[PDB]
Design a protein around this ligand. Structure first.
Ligand SMILES: O=c1c(O)c(-c2ccc(O)c(O)c2)oc2cc(O)ccc12
Length: 665
């Protein structure tokens, strides 16, 4: 039986209580041969009629309209509580059990597919997780808080980033999920305008079946007779519907809450709602009471409100009708040996009703994060070098790891927020940091390497940490506020990195802020915090990322300029030029200024008191000092500037291009 475009649209559209862009659906039906419809679930085991039958009804509607239906089985979350693949294998069995019930329940599987998050995520780690982070990177945390159900949220701002990603991961054309999941699907449509993909996913949201008792807008997990379950006997079915709330009132559609979920009112009739969803929503079904048959749902609704049909009869009718729908399942799990076993295995898990901390490191291990900056201050770089040398000496059998945060920083929206730009920045500034004297003992590892190296475990701990900490708690690390949701993730990742690298100490710079203190907090004061030593090379303007502070990517021409504009009045014993000299003096052990004889003559200083004497009250002219310092900076940066014009010249093109994009906006 061939269906024209109009008939296909009617059938498909009839799945949704709402359809975000009927025009977009219509256009999809006209243009596209295999439309991806998508839905998803975590296996629970106790399957209720809305999930058992109603889903089957709607899926069958999509596949008849010429769609393909991909179910996203969210089993990856079993890796959370896992002890040697234990919980995962159970959840996959529950998973297979649900599928078998659907088969028996009458879902046409010819164009239906089941994907398992555990298989598909881990197999496509990069593609998957980078998007998850990108959706977070480009979204205010307020916008993502809206997607979850005062502030008790605790990294439940992560699951929506994942759920949203799934839609694009699977290339879903239609998001055929419940109306309760409306808000995430919206966020999908929004994210579509961010990633340039031209066609937004059509949100075809199905009806939330009502609870059987009064004051229930939805099925309840506390109340096992709030809805019919698939394992319920025909005696159970009779009992539950007989006691069910049943107002004699003509049912009208509820107002569309932007918060997807339904609301419980007194004139909401679940006996009638069932007839509409599990009976009349089937292709050519109709109810029969006392000889007469009602072709429309409306016909039955009238006959009930006119009192042509009794509440006794109406329920008796549903009871037989619902039992008719379950019997094929009941029969199948009796006859079929393999199916019966599936159920018996699922049943056995029910007798448990009503994670360990990672091992410390044997020997010291320091960790440090390269700042995700276009231009890194020399003051900060020298602080990092000293803290490394100070750690390696103080713990000579220990190790130091510098982590280039090429995943974290893109999540945080540092620099331009582009992978290539942040990779280049981290790669360039790292090479230069080594050119200024970073020890060779330091292990340089990227997050890309660390995360992919042991990917499954990594994200488990990111979430595991996420579950144990409140959202507001993580926002305290950024001073009470985050710029986007990605900053929340970046925080979690750093602790996750610390733990996987098995680190004893976390080195923080002034740029890292309180973010690294999280690792200390989470490990119960086990990981010690070492702070960097800064405030030695100051800004070159007079007292009162600009262009009066020395960066570690300054070339020979840049250094000459910045020194030239440095503030220094004559007969002065405290100014930027003095502070830099005393630092160079201290590091070196002497500061030799060269002069014409009778211009003062040549002189050295090996103490700060001696130098300040000749400046404030003496013959050390400002100009003489600055000519001495400028040479010393050029000499100490000879190795680094050689890299700028040679090895890093390729990447320096990418950074100056990034810099101009930032100045534009
Ligand atoms: O764990 C998931 C889940 O429970 C639901 C869901 C919840 C209520 C609904 O009414 C519905 O249609 C889907 O979606 C998902 C979509 C994903 O990409 C991943 C996981 C879930």
């Amino acid at each position: 039986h061939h269906m024209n475009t109009d008939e296909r649209y009617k059938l498909l559209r009839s799945v949704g209580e709402e359809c975000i862009q009927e025009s977009e659906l219509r256009n999809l039906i006209e243009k596209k041969p295999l439309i991806r419809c998508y839905d998803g679930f975590e296996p629970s085991g106790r399957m209720h009629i809305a999930q058992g039958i109603f889903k089957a009804v709607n899926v069958n509607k999509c596949t008849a309209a010429g769609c393909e239906f991909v179910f996203w089985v969210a089993d990856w979350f079993a890796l959370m509580n896992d002890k040697v693949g234990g919980e995962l294998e159970k959840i996959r069995i529950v998973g297979r059990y649900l599928i078998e019930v659907w088969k028996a329940a009458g879902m046409d599987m010819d164009k239906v597919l089941f994907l398992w998050s555990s298989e598909e995520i881990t197999s496509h780690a990069d593609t998957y997780w980078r998007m998850v982070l990108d959706i977070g990177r480009q979204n205010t945390i307020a916008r993502i808080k809206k997607c979850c159900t005062g502030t008790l949220t605790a990294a439940q701002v992560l699951y929506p980033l994942m759920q949203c990603c799934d839609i694009f991961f699977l290339k879903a054309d239609i998001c055929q999920l419940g109306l309760d999941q409306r808000k995430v699907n919206m966020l999908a449509r929004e994210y579509c305008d961010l990633i340039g993909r031209k066609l937004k996913p059509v949100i075809l949201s199905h009806h939330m079946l009502a609870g059987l008792k009064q004051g229930q807008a939805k099925m309840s997990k506390s109340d096992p007779d709030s809805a019919i379950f698939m394992e319920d006997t025909e005696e159970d079915v009779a009992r539950k519907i007989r006691q069910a709330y049943c107002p004699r009132v003509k049912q009208s559609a509820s107002a569309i809450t932007d918060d997807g979920a339904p609301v419980a009112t007194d004139d909401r009739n679940p006996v009638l709602d069932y007839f509409q969803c599990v009976v009349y929503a089937r292709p050519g079904a109709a109810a029969t009471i006392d000889g007469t048959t009602y072709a429309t749902y409306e016909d039955l609704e009238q006959a009930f409100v006119s009192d042509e049909v009794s509440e006794d009869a109406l329920k008796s009718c549903l009871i037989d009708e619902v039992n008719a729908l379950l019997e094929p399942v009941r029969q199948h799990f009796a006859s079929n040996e393999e199916a019966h076993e599936l159920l018996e295995a699922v049943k056995s898990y029910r007798k448990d009703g009503a994670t360990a901390l990672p091992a410390a490191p044997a020997k010291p291990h320091a960790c440090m994060w390269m700042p995700a900056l276009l231009k890194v201050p020399l003051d900060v770089a020298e602080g990092m070098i000293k803290v490394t040398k100070d750690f390696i000496a103080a713990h000579p059998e220990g190790t130091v790891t510098l982590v280039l945060p090429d995943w974290s920083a893109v999540a945080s929206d540092e620099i331009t927020g582009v992978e290539k730009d942040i990779s280049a920045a981290l790669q360039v500034n790292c090479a230069l940091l080594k050119a200024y004297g970073l020890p060779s003992s330091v292990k340089i590892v990227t997050e890309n390497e660390v995360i992919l190296g042991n990917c499954d475990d990594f994200w488990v701990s990111v979430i595991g940490i996420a579950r144990k900490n409140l959202l507001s708690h993580v926002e305290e690390l950024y001073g009470g506020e985050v710029r986007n949701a990605g900053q929340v993730i970046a925080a979690l990742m750093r602790v996750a990195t610390a733990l996987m690298l098995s680190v004893s100490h976390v080195i923080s710079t002034s740029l890292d802020g309180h973010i690294n203190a999280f690792a200390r907090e989470y490990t119960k004061e086990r990981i010690d915090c070492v702070q960097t030593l800064e405030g030695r090379i100051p800004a070159l303007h007079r007292p009162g990322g600009a262009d009066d502070v020395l960066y570690l990517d300054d070339n020979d021409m840049d250094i000459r300029r910045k020194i030239k504009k440095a503030y220094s009045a004559p007969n002065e014993e405290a100014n930027p030029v003095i502070s830099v000299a005393q630092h160079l003096l201290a590091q070196h052990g002497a500061l030799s200024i060269e002069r014409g004889e009778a211009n003062g003559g040549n002189v050295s200083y090996n103490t700060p008191e001696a130098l300040v004497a000749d400046c404030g009250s003496g013959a050390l002219h400002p100009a003489d000092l600055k000519a001495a310092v400028l040479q010393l900076l050029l000499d100490r940066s000879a190795q680094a500037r050689a890299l700028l014009n040679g090895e890093l010249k390729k990447n320096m093109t990418v950074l100056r291009n990034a810099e101009k994009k930032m100045a534009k906006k």
